[PDB]
Design a protein around this ligand. Sequence first.
Ligand SMILES: CCn1c(NC(C)=O)nc2ccccc21
Ligand SMILES: [Zn+2]
Ligand SMILES: [Zn+2]
Length: 582
Amino acid sequence: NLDIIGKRIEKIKQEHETSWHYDQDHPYKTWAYHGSYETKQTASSMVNGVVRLLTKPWDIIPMVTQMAMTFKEKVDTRTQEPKEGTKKLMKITAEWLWKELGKKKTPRMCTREEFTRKVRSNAALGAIFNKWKSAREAVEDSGFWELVDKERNLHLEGKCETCVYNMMSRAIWYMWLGARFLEFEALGFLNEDHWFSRENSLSGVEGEGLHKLGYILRDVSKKEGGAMYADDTAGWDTRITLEDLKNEEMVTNHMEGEHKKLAEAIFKLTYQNKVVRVQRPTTVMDIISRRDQRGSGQVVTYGLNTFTNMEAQLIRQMEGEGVFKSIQHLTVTEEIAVKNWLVRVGRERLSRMAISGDDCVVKPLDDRFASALTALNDMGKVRKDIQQWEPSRGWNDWTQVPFCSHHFHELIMKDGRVLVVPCRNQDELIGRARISQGAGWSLRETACLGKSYAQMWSLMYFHRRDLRLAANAICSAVPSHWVPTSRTTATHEWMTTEDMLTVWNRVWIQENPWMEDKTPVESWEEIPYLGKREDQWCGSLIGLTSRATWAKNIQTAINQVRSLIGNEEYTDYMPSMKRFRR
Ligand SMILES: CCn1c(NC(C)=O)nc2ccccc21
Ligand SMILES: [Zn+2]
Ligand SMILES: [Zn+2]
């Protein structure tokens, strides 16, 4: 407790020595409270005018327009200690899973050099302003690295001074860039060296891309077994137990030298003991601590979420298969049985899953899985929107299964070849493309963000009539040579100045391991759509008067945006579609 977090707490006290006050009306039940001090401050969602001017029919669709307008009583809840049988199942499974993930990978420190390159191309690291303005500037300045050094030698000494979280079903924990560096140095290898790739982890999909996820679900569907289960957890990050954090730390058993010590310190000092600053309007800053829940960088959070979810779902499969009888207590012979299941069929059972952080699809050996709930509930991974002891409802068709906010269609090209394509309700796609984050956007930067959405649509959602037409319109309205941009950066093949038909051929034909015939597609008209009725089911406006006027008059909308941007070099992409091809 306070021996590990005191120094951090004591240091914050002194920089606010005039304001420190142990408040009596503190709202915390499950967080340990330590004190308060004076502050005052908060960026809402802005509309992208280029995308909105080229999507006029959606200006009267509330599901689109409401997206641009605008529970913290879940972070203040407490998960119970699992029972002895559960803790044993988790420890045995975690031990086995780190060994499997480590068979063909070597843990290693990530470098200042790697960190510096990351910041200089805008990956959302979850940092803050202060001393230097941005991340870009702190990294050049040698003073920073001396701060990093001080903390670093403090961590080698098993102590912490400056690794403090800042709080702000989405609760995001920013730290200062130095704290994020030390996290990345110790645990960045999990993402940087693709520990959760499908090749390496069998269940994982890290680096796979939205154009692979449907093919992966169809491959899971080919296994003999029961229904496909896709149960969401209620507030996954808030249900991570101290026992979960201790099984995650066992990755350090695979490390050596300095790295082992640096990694052990991140787990001990920042993950299994946390210090947090939360803005309370009543305006103070509260300095609160707790031992459990997930609060790491968003990229380390993804890998450890994937790890602990893989572990949980293997244990639920063991329960359905009757490998153990009760979570109260594993006998000595049950331990040997669980161990022999893992050695014997563990890799086969991992291949029956697709797991992206807290998101999973499982095709178990049979439907006993549906009612195998004791371990899942006792680990604290309580299912969303179903009663605790009500059996899971599975999906009979891989094309109906939800995964990573999508479903997947099987789409046959006029030449007989098979595409498995990502899809979601089209109101969600248009509503997200109409939103920008942050201030100070020039017209050119706003246009380049619209172009990024347009190229994503041409690559991933070409099968939706309205999105292929709107993508062509935006790419016609933005100068041909202007480079697509984003402010937070799945594989992103649309973020390129290359012709989108050439990128389509590379992604869907040449590099697609599920496509045996590699004959290139010569035009967009070879590339199919969903059925018209299926397109309407997934939110198309095809058939409406508003949509017919928009499509017919599209060159007038394109010219409105071209007139605002000014006299630049533009390409007309609309004749790539049959109906505008004369
Ligand atoms: C090398 C790949 N590539 C990119 N990619 C970018 C800008 O990331 N833009 C291109 C334009 C024409 C031809 C190839 C191109
Ligand atoms: Zn620290
Ligand atoms: Zn669909």
